[PDB]
Amino acid sequence: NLSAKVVQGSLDSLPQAVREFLENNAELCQPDHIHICDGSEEENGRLLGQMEEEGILRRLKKYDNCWLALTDPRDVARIESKTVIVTQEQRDTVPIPKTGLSQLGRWMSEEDFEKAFNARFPGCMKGRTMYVIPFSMGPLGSSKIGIELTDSPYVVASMRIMTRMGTPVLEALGDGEFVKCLHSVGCPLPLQKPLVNNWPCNPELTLIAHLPDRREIISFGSGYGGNSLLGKKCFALRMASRLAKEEGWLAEHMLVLGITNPEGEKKYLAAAFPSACGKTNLAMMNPSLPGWKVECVGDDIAWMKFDAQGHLRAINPENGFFGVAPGTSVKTNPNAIKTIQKNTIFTNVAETSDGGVYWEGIDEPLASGVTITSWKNKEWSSEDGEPCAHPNSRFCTPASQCPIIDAAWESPEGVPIEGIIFGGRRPAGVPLVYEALSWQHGVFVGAAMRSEAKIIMHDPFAMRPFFGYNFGKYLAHWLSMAQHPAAKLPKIFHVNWFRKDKEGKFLWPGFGENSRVLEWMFNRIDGKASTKLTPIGYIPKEDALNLKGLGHINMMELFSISKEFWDKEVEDIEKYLVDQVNADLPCEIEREILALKQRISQM
Ligand SMILES: C=CCn1c(=O)c2[nH]c(Cc3ccc(NC(C)=O)cc3)nc2n(CCCC)c1=O
Numbered sequence: 343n344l345s346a347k348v349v350q351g352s353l354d355s356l357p358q359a360v361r362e363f364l365e366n367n368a369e370l371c372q373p374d375h376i377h378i379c380d381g382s383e384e385e386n387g388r389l390l391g392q393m394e395e396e397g398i399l400r401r402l403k404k405y406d407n408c409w410l411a412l413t414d415p416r417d418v419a420r421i422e423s424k425t426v427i428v429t430q431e432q433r434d435t436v437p438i439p440k441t442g443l444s445q446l447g448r449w450m451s452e453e454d455f456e457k458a459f460n461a462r463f464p465g466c467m468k469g470r471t472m473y474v475i476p477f478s479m480g481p482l483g484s485s486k487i488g489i490e491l492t493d494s495p496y497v498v499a500s501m502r503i504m505t506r507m508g509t510p511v512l513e514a515l516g517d518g519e520f521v522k523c524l525h526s527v528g529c530p531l532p533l534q535k536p537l538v539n540n541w542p543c544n545p546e547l548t549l550i551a552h553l554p555d556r557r558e559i560i561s562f563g564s565g566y567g568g569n570s571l572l573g574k575k576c577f578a579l580r581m582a583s584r585l586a587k588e589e590g591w592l593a594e595h596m597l598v599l600g601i602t603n604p605e606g607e608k609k610y611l612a613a614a615f616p617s618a619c620g621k622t623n624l625a626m627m628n629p630s631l632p633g634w635k636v637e638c639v640g641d642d643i644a645w646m647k648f649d650a651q652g653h654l655r656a657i658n659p660e661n662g663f664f665g666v667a668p669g670t671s672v673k674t675n676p677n678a679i680k681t682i683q684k685n686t687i688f689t690n691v692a693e694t695s696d697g698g699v700y701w702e703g704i705d706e707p708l709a710s711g712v713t714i715t716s717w718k719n720k721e722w723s724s725e726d727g728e729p730c731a732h733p734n735s736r737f738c739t740p741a742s743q744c745p746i747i748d749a750a751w752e753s754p755e756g757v758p759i760e761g762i763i764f765g766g767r768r769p770a771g772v773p774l775v776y777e778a779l780s781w782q783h784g785v786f787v788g789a790a791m792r793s794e795a796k797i798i799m800h801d802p803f804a805m806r807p808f809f810g811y812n813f814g815k816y817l818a819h820w821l822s823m824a825q826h827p828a829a830k831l832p833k834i835f836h837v838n839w840f841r842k843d844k845e846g847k848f849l850w851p852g853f854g855e856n857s858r859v860l861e862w863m864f865n866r867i868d869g870k871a872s873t874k875l876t877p878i879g880y881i882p883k884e885d886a887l888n889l890k891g892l893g894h895i896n897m898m899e900l901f902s903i904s905k906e907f908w909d910k911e912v913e914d915i916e917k918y919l920v921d922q923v924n925a926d927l928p929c930e931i932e933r934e935i936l937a938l939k940q941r942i943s944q945m
């Protein structure tokens with residue numbers, strides 16, 4: 343029966359639990375074939391070739407083994423609306439707000455989800471191959487393993503880069519447990535609807551669901567990576583944050599980097615930023631300060647767990663970078679540019695006529711007669727009034743290829759976090775850098791995060807779309823870390839690269855010069871008496887920030903804290919947290935809200 347549909351591998355060499363998961367979902371989805379992924383170069387070559395034949399990928403001949411996927415324009419981003427967590431009780435998933443609808447996640451009842459599942463999954467893979475992806479989140483060797491079933495070869499190839507994938511994962515798994523991951527593009531053959539750019543999706547029925555009690559992730563109708571690469575946001579943030587809450591650790595939307603001063607002293611820092619803040623540019627930043635070194639552990643997700651000496655240790659559970667393409671250049675991110683030179687999948691970027699990539703802000707003058715095809719497969723000029731690349735277009739690239747990849751990026755011990763950075767995009771009022779007054783205040787600073795998307799929105803811990811459970815409880819869990827025995831708590835900082843003058847010009851040059859801010863953090867961690875007290879925390883004392891080699895910087899306006907601005911700010915923060923977190927807001931946070939208005943009242 344089922345064996346006859348297998349086109350690669352053998353049912354018999356799957357652990358019983360993997361086999362049963364496959365059997366149940368094959369019976370349900372009715373795929374024409376089953377391909378058990380081995381994760382070999384040869385398999386990758388084959389799937390890339392097949393995808394080229396079918397129009398899903400084009401070859402980018404300018405480079406060594408680079409490819410380009412163009413999507414249906416309806417399927418270009420994750421949809422928060424259609425992203426749900428399923429629990430017996432709503433409160434376990436999101437706080438019940440005081441007014442309005444929750445902005446802290448989306449809950450669906452078990453009953454509603456069973457209905458939603460039956461209207462989508464039966465027969466969904468008809469005419470397609472079901473791929474079986476064994477993957478490890480974190481280095482191969484305890485780490486969490488999952489099995490993703492998908493009808494998308496694009497997902498297979500992306501998973502190979504973004505996770506450890508294939509036969510060795512099944513070998514490490516044995517009869518262990520795994521997260522069950524089910525994905526379909528939702529377009530059974532014969533196609534009932536038009537195919538755009540050979541890219542199957544079902545936007546109307548798109549649903550990305552998490553069932554934490556069953557250890558199941560179920561995703562329908564979208565091929566876009568945030569929705570389809572189930573190890574990443576779905577597992578390593580949402581489900582894991584839940585597990586972490588239970589087991590006394592932390593799963594966070596954080597880059598991790600290692601920074602070394604000119605005397606050879608090295609610290610690791612984790613940072614959470616909302617979108618459009620240049621996460622990845624900071625993760626592999628090339629520092630301008632002489633003698634300094636920055637190395638990249640990860641640009642997206644961090645798993646953090648206290649060791650026996652109370653140090654918070656971080657592992658990057660990913661195997662790659664799924665980076666925003668537009669804005670990437672030799673100037674803004676020289677390390678990303680070298681990373682993506684080979685073995686990289688690009689999605690929704692433009693293509694030059696010599697088979698190179700192009701996007702807004704690539705800052706690379708075209709040769710004579712070279713022209714650009716846009717991401718909607720049209721000839722493109724700068725007079726079109728339309729970007730050549732989609733704003734959310736991506737590169738998907740092996741982490742091992744980053745020239746400053748950290749030597750301990752795959753250490754199963756993890757790397758000791760000495761500082762946590764929170765930040766946002768704030769055109770007014772928020773200084774370039776400040777330090778939390780205490781752990782409790784640092785939790786509040788994370789909880790208070792807002793960022794410009796032209797709208798300024800709340801995005802606490804940069805986790806707004808990613809909480810796996812009640813944010814009030816997530817806040818209590820963060821607070822609880824100050825009572826871990828002998829905890830060596832990271833110093834907490836808040837940054838803003840994006841403060842502007844009245845004409846909208848950026849006050850801080852940023853990029854490589856951000857090394858000057860990390861320098862201040864670095865020395866503060868080491869106890870340097872370099873702080874000046876303000877109502878919002880510590881800022882750099884006068885002349886403490888290293889400005890050697892820069893043009894003029896308006897330091898006064900950059901570090902300016904206005905009573906009027908901060909009155910408006912704390913009112914907005916209180917309002918947001920009391921309303922949205924309501925009965926689940928920990929009283930330590932209530933105290934921090936009051937303490938801040940009290941400090942502001944005194945100015
Ligand atoms: C480690 C670097 C992080 N970083 C920054 O530090 C940063 N700072 C800015 C604002 C800025 C933009 C352009 C200039 N250019 C010139 C010439 O002054 C200066 C500041 N944009 C920044 N960006 C781009 C974010 C959008 C994807 C950014 O990524």
Ligand SMILES: [Mn+2]
Nearest residue numbers: 595621642643
């Ligand atoms: Mn992210």
